[PDB]
Amino acid sequence: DIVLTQSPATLSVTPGDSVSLSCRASQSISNNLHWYQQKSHESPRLLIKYASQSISGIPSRFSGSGSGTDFTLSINSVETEDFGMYFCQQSNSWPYTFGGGTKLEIKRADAAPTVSIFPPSSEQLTSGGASVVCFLNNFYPKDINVKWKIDGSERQNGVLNSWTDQDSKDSTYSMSSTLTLTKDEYERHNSYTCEATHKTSTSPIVKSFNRNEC
Amino acid sequence: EVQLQESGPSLVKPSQTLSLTCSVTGDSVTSDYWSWIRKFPGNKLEYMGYISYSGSTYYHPSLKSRISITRDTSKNQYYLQLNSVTTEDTATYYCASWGGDVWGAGTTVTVSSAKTTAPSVYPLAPVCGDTTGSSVTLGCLVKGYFPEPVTLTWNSGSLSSGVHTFPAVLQSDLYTLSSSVTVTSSTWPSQSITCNVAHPASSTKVDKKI
Fold first, then answer.
1. Does B10 share its domain with B62?
2. Do B121 and B187 belong to one domain?
3. Nearest by Cα to B185 from B113, B126, B132, B141
4. Which residues of chain A does B165 touch, with a Cβ-Cβ cutoff of 8 Å?
5. How would you class A116 by CB atoms within 10 Å of its CB: exposed for 0-12, middle for 13-18, buried for 19 or more?
6. Which of B51, B45, B43 minimizes the C-alpha distance to A40?
7. What are the chain A neighbours of B177 within 8 Å (beta carbons)?
8. A163–B167 C-beta distance less than 8 A
9. How many CB pairs under 8 A join A and B?
10. Domain shared by A120 and A44, yes or no
11. Residue B76 sits in which domain range?
12. What is the CATH number of the domain that holds A22?
């Protein structure tokens, strides 16, 4: 099938700036290329038709160009409502296919995450579970690495992460990282550490606790 | 002039076949070509197939013989039928005119064999060493429930600022989610904070003061 490659994967811009998104087809597809914008819990919205055909109701700042294998979507002077996902779709050959999409995010000043660690509750332990929770909140950029250490040794299995979308109010990101152990294993160790490595600090942010303390 | 709307069960077992309905209002279902589109996790969109203004169907080769798109000229509706589904068919389904000019709102369909299970709600209280700052962060852990969704609020909704409720994730067929809330340190624990969790499917509604 026809593979559409979109770039960049993500675009961080300042409102009022003009941007250009790329979409490359693995084969010539003439001008049978279409662009879409899609927001959370929302269906895609047709922006441009057949490479450069304008769509009724769509803002002026939106324009498309290209043909064959190369296409570009341009947004002149991006507004606050333009952030979200952008996809290209070809209708040249069946099956019709979509590119991987390019996320357009709002750029903001870097912000260090506020990290908080929580041991398993007595309530959960009684049931035999032991979830150690670590919140890393309101940071920017989105790129962040979290390492779990038990008695000084890195732990990877049993770790599950979850991220919020960029906040529409402060433009930051937040994430939860949870190390889920059984009570049996949790009680065979003492020190539990959540380590966050982020652009905003030369050294990782460390939050830890010992089972033998409080 | 046309509006689209998807409807159908949101939970389908691997032992069942999936059916979704798209209601066309405005013009006739016989006045254009209509498609079914789905978005899998990771923002992966798939053009499943379409049915012409005359009833002719075309399907994505990858869905080969698993899919059937049909219509009813009397009711002005068209349907998506998908059999031998697996968890990989879990996604957001949309109906739309084949050119993408008009779309439905989209609807979620989860494929799982999991049984309805009430969530366990655990408190995430600050360790003694992290209550010395200007603010303090507390949390609530909701684990082992099925199916989605659950609704979590703080102090029955009166506490909404400084809250981060994360998307649920799967843990061997059961969902888990956590929420953090951050308030000025001087006001807590003197001014209590309670996590409220509701899971409609298991008729669960509980409060856990942190």
1. yes
2. yes
3. B132
4. 164
5. buried
6. B43
7. 162
8. yes
9. 125
10. no
11. 1-113
12. 2.60.40.10
